[PDB]
């Protein structure tokens, strides 16, 4: 009995892919050939996303070197078959997805039972071509992928006829219309952009005067400017009067793919990095050359670091170019150095590259199953050669790179033994142990990072594991729910690589200002670098500040559905995260919320705030008033809204319910207030047909004339408003629900409500209602104070406040907000939204999926190699930007840190500072600056408070000049410096040797 989706597990993925896409995924059987690193990584991501079945084929024996990137293998599995040994561990990732083993692929006919077949590095080109031909001609979707050291590729072939249902996954563009001219020119209301492109399609509703333009018909968009687009003539439909909302529609696109055989000699490229576009053709030849080589050398790849074999590869590539001068184009030479490196690295198995292709290919599998997002069409090549260290520090030759009979051998194959040991003796702080965190720790387990006697890993995360996390936090199991993320993740990766036994310090502390006693000078100074795995901006800003202060590199990343990004912050080199602004969260105007909504986002906001006030704030206020003897005197002199707070207490204590029946009543009376009386009030001030000073109708554009609601228990939203309201109210007052063991019953509520006197509405003639945020706002408080009961008549009466939890479906919260928003939506003729959508907005949920998370984490660990080598050439580093939907990959050299000058002295405006050893006297500080820096201190301050200025008269200088900085702060702030504090940042202004104010670094005082 399937055709439905587990929202509690798939919640966040569901907001990326959508329900239709996932229903198609749940009918698709996927087959993966080869279960080395690449295969298991692809499989993991696909199994997490939830397809109908996963089948894995790898009859090869496990060897120690396979552990380089195959996180589900162990030394105990050596000799046994990769497929058999991996199966059970993939199964544990998602109990809804059976994971099977194909024993044998002697019969290609067995492919017919699968909808998508994926061929990894274990499958020869000869067999990839046979298998592709079978798949292509039978309607089976085919994807292949290969990693070879720091290089990699992927190939996609979805057959002759594949339909893309949604090219991007973006919210359809929508907007309000003020005019439609006869030639089809649609002008937007006020200064709202349509945000469409030429060749988008749109449908309309509410356009008065053009009847059938609203019937669902699509119109092709010709963009005229930011504020208008044209749809072709509309004089046939009538003449525009007023109103109208347009809605973008994604139309289906049929596309065709070519076989692998055709694409080998005539490929279509998607580029991984436009800085390296010339390399795509070269590598296309190079990866074919590796297969030709293997055919010549009994299935062996070139030898690690070996010139003889590399020259053979260059000959092989040159024969493909001389034979067909059309993959490289006329008169274009083979890049012999590039091919040389491909030979040198061909046996390499690099965690970050595997992670990149694993995320990518897994998402391409999902596209293949669903028609969601734009497929990769058809070949992409990739390299991260910038990750190679300087050979002067870590030389690469046949000796340094040889296997040492360890799990790291095919990492050593690329970087050398010495480099690998420096990775193991690194000391790192990982801030977060969720999606990025889990992927990060897996990658570090695979690197052996922190495994050496000089190294360690500290990971901290202050959350416990919730169910929806399991969809992309692959180290957590259903039975780990409720435990702490960091602790569980640390244990999990130690099973993956026991070299990290006792090397990970899993902490549960919140990073920030309240934990600096723990994460202190000594803690930070000890680290080599810091990596963020965070879910919010303020935390990133905080870690950034501290990285600057302690001069530590920072590896930053982030995701939002299929979109992602990486950033590197290098001491003394680059700008920091804080250096650049991101687009802020747009705020809704207050009048729009309070009186004139037109989008469900507005009704949800309003309903969420109503929820806070009804079931959280009014309770906290009652509890404060009963427990703080000075509350009323406090509130009167430190609240903007005084009257609100006092009515909230008066109301809270005079209506006290005695049973659930009273809670139901209260809720039904609130329905009348909010959706009936308040609306009739707003219409009393502004009638349907009201006009403004120009004589144009008041209700037009963003203003939708409301109708009052007539309560109707059969209406879902009216019902649930009352159910959820009553159940929450009961929770506040400690009353047991009739609901707390089972479903709400319509007839039960109906028989309470049917017997109620609902008081009729009378208007207030003096209520002003604010029409704009520009426009102003417009004794009885001594009466309100007199009305409040003495707290001694309510001894030990607590109200229990509600604490918004969006991910518990039994708690009525999303039930309330959804119903309350929708009742308001009914009022204003806005399309009602369901629970999943209301939860997304009210709960501020970030869409997330494992694919993007692995890929972005992969790219971070390709930049990590560059920190290990202490790279100071900014041109070697890559900030990354992705969107797997498109698919799109772009990279950029970090921005350099801005520099300054004072006197003849160059300085870094982010990184440089004046370190003063000791609790120096003010006079000695001022002197040190003139004597040693050429600087005449002009102001000196500690945070908010001013310690010295050159304009101070002599009386004031006498008090301060002889004081140590700590006593000087004491004099001015009247605070002690706390005991725990060991550094103080002082900001200064100064004049240089000419007597001119100059910008200069900050000061750190080391106590």
């Amino acid at each position: 009995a399937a055709g439905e989706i587990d929202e509690s597990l798939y919640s966040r993925q569901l907001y990326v892919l959508g329900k239709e896409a996932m229903l198609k995924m749940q009918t698709s059987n996927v087959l993966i050939l080869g279960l080395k690193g690449l295969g298991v990584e692809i499989a993991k991501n696909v199994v997490l996303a939830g397809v109908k079945s996963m089948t894995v084929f790898d009859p090869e024996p496990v060897q120690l070197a396979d552990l380089s990137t195959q996180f589900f293998l162990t030394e105990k599995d050596i000799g046994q078959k990769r497929g058999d040994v991996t199966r059970a561990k993939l199964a544990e990732l998602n109990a809804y997805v059976p994971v099977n083993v194909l024993d044998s692929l002697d019969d290609v006919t067995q492919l017919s039972q699968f909808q998508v077949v994926v061929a990894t590095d274990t499958v020869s080109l000869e067999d990839k071509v046979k298998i592709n031909e079978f798949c292509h001609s039978s309607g089976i979707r085919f994807i292949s992928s290969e990693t070879r050291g720091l290089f990699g590729n992927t190939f996609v072939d979805l057959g002759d006829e594949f339909t893309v249902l949604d090219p991007t996954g973006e919210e359809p563009r929508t907007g309000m219309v003020s005019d439609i001219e006869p030639d089809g020119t649609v002008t937007m209301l006020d200064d709202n952009r349509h945000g469409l492109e030429d060749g988008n399609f749109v449908r309309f509703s509410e356009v008065e005067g053009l009847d059938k333009l609203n019937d669902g018909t699509l119109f092709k968009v010709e963009v005229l400017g930011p504020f208008a687009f044209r749809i072709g003539s509309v004089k046939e439909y009538g003449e525009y009067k007023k109103g109208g909302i347009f809605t973008e529609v994604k139309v289906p696109r049929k596309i065709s793919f070519k076989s692998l055989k055709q694409q080998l000699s005539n490929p279509e490229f998607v580029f991984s990095d436009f800085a390296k576009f010339d390399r795509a053709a070269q590598l296309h030849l190079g990866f074919q050359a590796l297969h030709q080589f293997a055919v010549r050398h009994n299935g062996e790849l070139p030898r690690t670091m070996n010139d003889e074999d590399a020259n053979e590869l260059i000959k092989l590539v040159t024969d493909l170019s001389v034979q067909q001068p059309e993959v490289l184009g006329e008169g274009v030479d083979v890049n012999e150095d590039l091919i040389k490196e491909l030979s040198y690295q061909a046996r390499g198995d690099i965690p970050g590259v595997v992670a990149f292709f694993g995320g990518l290919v897994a998402q391409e599998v999902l596209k293949a199953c669903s028609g969601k997002f734009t497929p990769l069409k058809q070949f992409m090549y990739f390299d991260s050669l910038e990750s190679l260290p300087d050979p002067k520090n870590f030389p690469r030759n046949e000796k340094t790179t040889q296997p040492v009979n360890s799990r790291y051998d095919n990492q050593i194959a690329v970087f050398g033994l010495d480099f690998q040991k420096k990775i193991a003796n690194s000391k790192v702080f990982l801030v977060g142990s969720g999606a990025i965190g889990c992927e990060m720790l897996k990658n570090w387990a695979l690197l052996g990072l922190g495994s050496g006697s000089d190294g360690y890993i500290v990971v901290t995360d202050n959350d416990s594991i919730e169910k929806s996390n399991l969809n992309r936090q692959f180290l957590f199991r259903p039975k780990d729910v409720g435990k702490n993320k960091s602790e569980v993740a640390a244990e999990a990766v130690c099973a993956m690589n026991p070299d990290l036994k006792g090397k990970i310090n899993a902490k549960i502390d919140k990073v920030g200002p309240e934990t600096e006693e723990i994460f202190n000078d000594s803690f930070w100074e000890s680290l080599d670098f810091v990596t963020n795995a965070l879910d919010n901006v303020d935390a990133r800003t905080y870690v950034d500040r501290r990285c600057v202060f302690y001069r530590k590199p920072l590896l930053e990343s982030g995701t939002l559905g299929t979109k992602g990004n990486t950033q590197v912050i290098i001491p003394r080199l680059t700008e920091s995260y804080s250096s650049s602004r991101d687009p802020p969260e747009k705020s809704i105007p207050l009048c729009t919320l309070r009186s004139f909504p037109n989008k469900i986002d507005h009704t949800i906001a309003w309903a969420k705030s109503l929820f806070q006030g009804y079931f959280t704030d009014s309770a906290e206020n009652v509890n404060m008033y009963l427990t703080q003897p000075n509350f009323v005197e406090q509130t009167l002199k430190q609240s903007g809204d005084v009257k609100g707070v006092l009515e909230s207490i008066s109301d809270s204590l005079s209506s006290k319910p005695h049973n659930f029946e009273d809670c139901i009543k209260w809720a039904r009376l609130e329905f009348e207030k909010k959706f009936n009386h308040d609306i009739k009030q707003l219409l009393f001030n502004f009638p349907k047909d009201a006009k403004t000073s120009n004589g144009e109708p008041f209700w037009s554009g963003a203003k939708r004339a409301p109708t009052p609601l007539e309560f109707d228990i059969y209406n879902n939203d009216h019902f649930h408003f009352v159910v959820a309201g009553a159940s929450l109210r009961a929770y506040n007052y400690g009353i047991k629900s009739d609901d707390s063991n089972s479903k709400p019953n319509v007839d039960e509520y109906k028989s309470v409500i049917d017997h109620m006197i609902i008081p009729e509405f009378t208007p207030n003639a003096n209520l002003k209602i604010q029409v704009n945020d520009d426009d102003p706002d417009p004794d009885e408080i001594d009466q309100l104070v007199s009305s409040l009961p003495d707290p001694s008549t309510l001894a030990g009466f607590k109200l229990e406040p509600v604490d918004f939890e969006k991910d518990d479906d039994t708690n009525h919260h999303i039930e309330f907000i959804t119903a309350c928003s929708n009742c308001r939506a009914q009022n204003y003729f806005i399309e009602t939204a369901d629970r999943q959508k209301t939860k997304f907005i009210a709960g501020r949920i970030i869409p997330a999926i494992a694919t993007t998370t692995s890929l972005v984490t992969g790219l971070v660990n390709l930049e990590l190699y560059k920190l290990i080598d202490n790279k100071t050439d900014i041109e070697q580093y890559k900030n990354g930007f992705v969107n797997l939907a498109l698919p799109f990959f772009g990279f950029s050299e970090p921005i350099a840190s801005p520099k300054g000058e004072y006197n003849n002295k160059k300085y870094d405006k982010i990184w440089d500072r004046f370190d003063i050893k000791g609790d120096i006297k003010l006079s000695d500080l001022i002197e040190h600056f003139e004597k040693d820096e050429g600087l005449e201190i002009t102001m000196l301050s500690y945070g908010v408070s001013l310690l010295y200025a050159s304009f101070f008269p002599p009386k004031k200088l006498k008090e301060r000049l002889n004081l140590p900085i700590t006593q000087l702060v004491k004099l001015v702030t009247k605070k002690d410096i706390p005991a725990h504090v060991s550094t103080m940042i002082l900001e200064i202004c100064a004049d240089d040797k000419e007597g001119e104010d100059v910008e200069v670094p900050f000061i750190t005082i080391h106590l």
Binding site: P167, T168, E170, R193, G195, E197, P226, D273, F274, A275, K276, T374, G432, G434, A435, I436, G437, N532, A533, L534, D535, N536, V537, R540, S557, G558, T559, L560, K563, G564, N565, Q567, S580, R581, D582, P583, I846, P847, A848, T853, K878, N879, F881, N883, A885, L886, F888, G890, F891, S892, E893, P894, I895
Partner: protein, 76 residues
């Protein structure tokens, strides 16, 4: 001449520009079309992020070149 700006959501904006135009200027034109303040714009082309006060010519931006308008994301 004509350049293109592709956004991270797949959108293609077309701009009328000259080789000597400042990046400041291209951002100005992008603001006119998209409404994004120049200070919130991250432009990238051929492996470089485009900096205020340099020119299109400085980054070797030809006719038909495609710039990417990219973002940082807060999820993790």
């Amino acid at each position: 001449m004509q350049i293109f700006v592709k956004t991270l959501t797949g959108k293609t904006i077309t701009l009328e520009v000259e080789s000597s135009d400042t990046i400041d200027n291209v951002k100005s034109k992008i603001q006119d079309k998209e409404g994004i303040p120049p200070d919130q714009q991250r432009l990238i082309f051929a492996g470089k992020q485009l900096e205020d006060g340099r020119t299109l010519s400085d980054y070797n931006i030809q006719k038909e070149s495609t710039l990417h308008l990219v973002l940082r994301l807060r999820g993790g």
